[PDB]
Amino acid sequence: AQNPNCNIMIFHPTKEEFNDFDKYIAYMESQGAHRAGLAKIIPPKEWKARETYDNISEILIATPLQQVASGRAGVFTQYHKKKKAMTVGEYRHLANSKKYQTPPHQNFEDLERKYWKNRIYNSPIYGADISGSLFDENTKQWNLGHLGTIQDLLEKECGVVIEGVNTPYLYFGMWKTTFAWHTEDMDLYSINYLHLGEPKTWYVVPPEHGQRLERLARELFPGSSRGCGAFLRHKVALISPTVLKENGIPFNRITQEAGEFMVTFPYGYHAGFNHGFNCAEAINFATPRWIDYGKMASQCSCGEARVTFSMDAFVRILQPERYDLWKRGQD
Ligand SMILES: O=C(O)CNC(=O)C(=O)O
Ligand SMILES: [Mg+2]
Ligand code: NI
Ligand SMILES: [Zn+2]
């Protein structure tokens, strides 16, 4: 079995290997990449997402989110307080202000220490889940706005035609902006490109060990656990690497830099933080290997998780028994 220790693998495709997305994902899996839950893909040196980032300041962040923490430094939840709209130019200024800027640090490890020590004492502002793309339409390889859709994959695999579309989202981050522990909707894959700015640190649990994370989460967030049998779908809970190590949960960490892709694999729990002002783009996708994960994905039916239009068909077709109860949570 390839990659039995579930290490995060890093790939360096040639420009020739960068032509066929599906084939390259399947190659990575042949080498065991999926076992980690997360892989890094460094694009060929000839490749570019677009010519420059000079003209992005007028993108609107219609609902910036202030991420307010509660709990203790290594075990906390965050809630998202909606703030007034601002442009990317305004947001970049805000991220760079004395109140919100990255502190002096030695290296990524020192910054990671400072994040876990101090995150809860600040409330950074995140521009998340903004429908759109920063890939030039003329970028033909690994353009996250031109991937094959999850609906077409399900049709090709299963023969059922369904409604729904599949489009990318932009994330504008600052120091301490945080993504809570989660898997993707319907345990899909995700791909994330860091277009510009400061890094993003990721933590990931191997898919084969996801239930160990869930068990710990139920212990650490006991009221949330009683409220919902899939409360990690709410995307609000954080657990530090120190805490994971204390409880014997297998995980790995890696820092993504501007110009690099990360792929998360089905049922790979992941969490992370941004080092400073940055812009990422991400999208879910599917492969044939995903189908069985989609059929087994947990679902939130308490009403908190509230997700896209397109998830309806996935639940309806892959999880008909759950559909009724899940839909009640949706409405
Ligand atoms: O970059 C972020 O804030 C969050 N991204 C993801 O969880 C992802 O790409 O799956
Ligand atoms: Mg603009
Ligand atoms: Ni994700
Ligand atoms: Zn729920």
Curated annotation (Swiss-Prot):
Enzyme class: oxidoreductase
Catalytic activity: N(6),N(6),N(6)-trimethyl-L-lysyl(9)-[histone H3] + 2 2-oxoglutarate + 2 O2 = N(6)-methyl-L-lysyl(9)-[histone H3] + 2 formaldehyde + 2 succinate + 2 CO2
Stretches of the chain forming a coiled coil according to its record: none
Binding annotation for Fe cation: H182, E184, H270
Cellular location(s): Nucleus
GO cellular component terms listed in the entry, alphabetical order: blood microparticle; chromatin; nucleoplasm; nucleus; pericentric heterochromatin; site of double-strand break
The JmjC domain, residue ranges: 136-302
Post-translational modification as stated in the protein's UniProt record: Ubiquitinated via 'Lys-63'-linked ubiquitin chains. Deubiquitinated by USP14 with the help of TRIM14 leading to stabilization.
Ligase recorded as keyword: no
Documented EC number(s): 1.14.11.66
Residues reported in the UniProt entry to bind 2-oxoglutarate: Y126, N192, K200, K235
GO-annotated biological processes: cellular response to ionizing radiation; chromatin remodeling; double-strand break repair via homologous recombination; inflammatory response; positive regulation of chromatin binding; positive regulation of double-strand break repair via nonhomologous end joining; regulation of gene expression; regulation of protein phosphorylation
Keyword annotations of the record: ADP-ribosylation, Chromatin regulator, Dioxygenase, Iron, Metal-binding, Nucleus, Oxidoreductase, Transcription, Transcription regulation, Ubl conjugation, Zinc
Cofactor dependency: Fe(2+)
All copies of domain JmjN, residue ranges: 8-50
Cofactor note: Binds 1 Fe(2+) ion per subunit.
Residues involved in Zn(2+) binding: C228, H234, C300, C302
PTM annotation (PolyADP-ribosyl glutamic acid): residues: E16, E17
GO molecular function: chromatin DNA binding; damaged DNA binding; histone demethylase activity; histone H3K9 demethylase activity; histone H3K9me2/H3K9me3 demethylase activity; metal ion binding
Function statement: Histone demethylase that specifically demethylates 'Lys-9' of histone H3, thereby playing a central role in histone code. Does not demethylate histone H3 'Lys-4', H3 'Lys-27', H3 'Lys-36' nor H4 'Lys-20'. Demethylates both di- and trimethylated H3 'Lys-9' residue, while it has no activity on monomethylated residues. Demethylation of Lys residue generates formaldehyde and succinate.
Family the entry assigns: Belongs to the JHDM3 histone demethylase family.
Protein name: Lysine-specific demethylase 4D
Residues of the full protein shown: 11 to 341 of 523
